[PDB]
Swiss-Prot record, chain A:
Gene label: spoVG
The family this protein is said to belong to: Belongs to the SpoVG family.
Task of the protein: Essential for sporulation. Interferes with or is a negative regulator of the pathway leading to asymmetric septation.
Top-rank taxon: Bacteria
HAMAP family: SpoVG
Keywords: Cell cycle, Cell division, Septation, Sporulation
GO BP terms: asexual sporulation; division septum assembly; sporulation resulting in formation of a cellular spore
Species lineage: Bacteria, Bacillati, Bacillota, Bacilli, Bacillales
Protein name: Putative septation protein SpoVG
Length: 94, 95
């Protein structure tokens, strides 16, 4: 079995800057990953894994998807929920 | 569908006395978690997840198994690998 984003918790960020939300994902109903950032980079919204700067100047994620596909399956879930919070709130407005 | 820690890779093993190994586990063949470390505490060994610092200054795991059995599993998966490497290491010298 492949792994599965099974839940997303998300907090919208309203301070301007690039970052639009910070979230956690639940993998397999079981494992939670914190500090995932939703960002407006000059090419569309994208999801960054929690990352660590090396004493080296450089950067690696603490939590790394191996394929770009599983990356995208993490990204989709987070962007989906994000936008879904957008338009459940919108519809509430009346 | 639960957790499957499919693989445990074990870097930096046995230099500091307390900080015993540095570990990368792979979940479900696709998702890797770095900077897990094997530390020797009060009662022997335990596996520490990577630490997030919250806004009030407390330290929390970035990587958090909600249930304790999942934690056990993860811990056992890591410790068996650490224990295996070392005892295989010694078995080299005997032969």
């Amino acid at each position: 079995n492949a792994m599965e984003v099974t839940d997303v918790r998300l907090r919208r960020v309203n301070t301007d800057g690039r970052m639009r939300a910070i979230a956690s994902i639940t993998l397999d109903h079981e494992f939670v990953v914190h500090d995932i950032r939703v960002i407006d980079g000059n090419n569309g919204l994208f999801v960054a894994m929690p990352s660590k700067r090396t004493p080296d100047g450089e950067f690696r994620d603490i939590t790394h998807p191996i394929n770009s596909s599983t990356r995208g399956k993490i990204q989709d879930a987070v962007l989906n929920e994000y936008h879904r919070l957008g338009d459940t709130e919108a519809l509430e407005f009346e």
